């Protein structure tokens, strides 16, 4: 078959603290003897709506963090502005800390969610960074410095820190140096994102999945220029393909012997006559979360 | 919006282990001093076309079957066979073990699933019991012996553990005590599984979901009777409601308000008359639970 599948969570749990200043409690992520969270731990409600983070961090002392790995509290001995996250330095390094990585997500690559709550780990799902540089998450009160993570032969790249839900319900962050992902800002405020576009490559990776899992009504004997294609697809607010694109399908073409610009003929039928009732892997919309490297670790180990 | 979402899988990673008999190899569950795995690891390639598990187990010894948690070998200290699972005891007890039972669950339930190949855990998932007993699974060679399982208060309850993969590419396995879900057996042949039909239980939950979210057009002025909506969901290939259906549905009936069987009224409305989106899709979901509804919508 073929599902969203998320990496196993456990070398990520092991690092999930709870963080509290004065009544603002939020998750951290606990790696050697630092503690990573969201910045606006330290403001009060008051604060939030034009927070001076400078202004307020200076106010603070090692004491004013209440840091706990479960019942356990850890002291802090050292705190530093991190962009839109702390660093808490404490005085014992966390012997769970896996082999890690902090890395910058691009649009259209996927990830793995742990979503915490008091520094309990809670759920985990699998996400894409959209090309508007929003992720749609499931994330309730009190979510804010859950993760996202990729892992590799027992490396965790983590790439995601949660801050924000905008009013539309998708979701906003930062990555683990505290950029915010997109135009977004740790203040109290609706804001907006840009417009959204489909992950053309992902959407192409999904089709070949269902070719390979059975799936292929959609298929027909014709064929496009990349040009052609990418005229359509972005008529339909989808990315544009690209020659390297195109060269990442190469190995699940060379699988299922479907040349890639004979999917993208498949794709723009597609786009124009609609799936009139019928479904694809299961669903009954074009699924774009699902990378080229996640379908052949699906389908292939 | 709802999403599958697959418990944190670390309290079970902590379990998973692999079990070689000859070059037959596939994952194992460690808790305490007992490894669990499927019986047919015992099997060459060719005496899973038609084995005699009783006959064929006479033959081994606690010396044939090479456990091992990453490249750690666990001594096998004791062998018994329950059902179709192997319980091989070890002469350590796993400290990684947590608060754990076993636990057989019923069609329509959810649960998540830790792929694990030679031993190691590759992803996580949530599936759902369909009723016809098979789950939509991902599973590759080497799958065998992963488990399914739900963590309620630090609490693994595992319900499942993988065997085969029916030529439709749907799964088949077992519950911890090795008794199949559905008619499967474990031996190398093409099984079919019974028509499936629509988990009515998740369907109802789906519609209280929206409801919570405001969606809630598709409520009417009738009641209907239990037995009156089974006679009509038959008829439409949806599943006949039970009397536990209607105490798992307790919680979402009283945080909205609406009585079980008036949402069953509005349910035979659409089922006759058809839908309008809810949700905000025209088809009606079934692989979320009410617990599933609970937890994504309070928390
Ligand atoms: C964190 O848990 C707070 O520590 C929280 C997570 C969200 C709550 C619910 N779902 C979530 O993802 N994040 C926030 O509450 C942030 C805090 C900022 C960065 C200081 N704020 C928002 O997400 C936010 C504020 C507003 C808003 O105002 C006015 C109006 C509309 C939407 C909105 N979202
Ligand atoms: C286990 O890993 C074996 O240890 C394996 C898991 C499947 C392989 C691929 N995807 C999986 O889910 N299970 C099997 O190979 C089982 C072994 C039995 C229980 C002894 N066999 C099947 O799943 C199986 C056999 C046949 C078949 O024959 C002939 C014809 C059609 C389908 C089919 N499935």
Redesign the interface.
């Known amino acids: ?11 990520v ?2 690092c999930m603290v709870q963080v509290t200043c004065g009544t603002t409690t939020l998750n951290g992520l606990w790696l050697d003897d630092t503690v990573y969270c969201p910045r606006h731990v330290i403001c009060t409600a008051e604060d939030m709506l034009n927070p001076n983070y400078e202004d307020l961090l200076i106010r603070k002392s090692n004491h004013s963090f209440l840091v706990q790995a479960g019942n356990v509290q850890l002291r802090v001995i050292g705190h530093s502005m991190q962009n839109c996250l702390l660093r808490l330095k404490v005085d014992t390094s966390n012997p769970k800390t896996p082999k890690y990585k902090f890395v910058r997500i691009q649009p259209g690559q996927t990830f793995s969610v ?2 915490c ?1 008091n520094g309990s ?5 699998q996400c894409a960074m959209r090309p508007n540089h929003t992720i ?1 998450g ?1 994330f ?3 979510s804010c410095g859950s993760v996202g993570f990729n892992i590799d032969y027992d490396c965790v790249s983590f790439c995601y820190m949660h801050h924000m839900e905008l009013p539309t ?1 998708v979701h906003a962050g930062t990555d683990l140096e505290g950029k915010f992902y997109g135009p977004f800002v740790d203040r109290q405020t609706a804001q907006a994102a840009g417009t959204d576009t489909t992950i053309t490559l992902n959407v192409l990776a999904w089709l070949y999945a269902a070719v390979i ?2 799936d292929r009504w959609f298929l027909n004997r014709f064929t496009t220029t990349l040009n052609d294609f990418n005229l359509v697809a972005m008529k339909y607010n989808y990315e544009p393909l690209t020659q390297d694109h195109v060269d990442i399908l190469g190995p699940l073409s060379a699988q299922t012997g479907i040349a890639v610009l004979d999917m993208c003929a498949a794709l723009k039928e597609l786009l124009q006559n609609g799936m009139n009732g019928r479904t694809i892997l ?1 669903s ?1 919309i074009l699924e774009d979360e699902f990378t080229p490297f996640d379908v052949v670790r ?4």
């Open positions: 078959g073929f599902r969203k599948m998320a990496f196993p969570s456990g070398k749990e092991g742990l979503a709550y780990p809670s759920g985990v799902y749609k499931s309730l009160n009190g319900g899992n059975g299961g009954t699906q389908c292939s180990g």
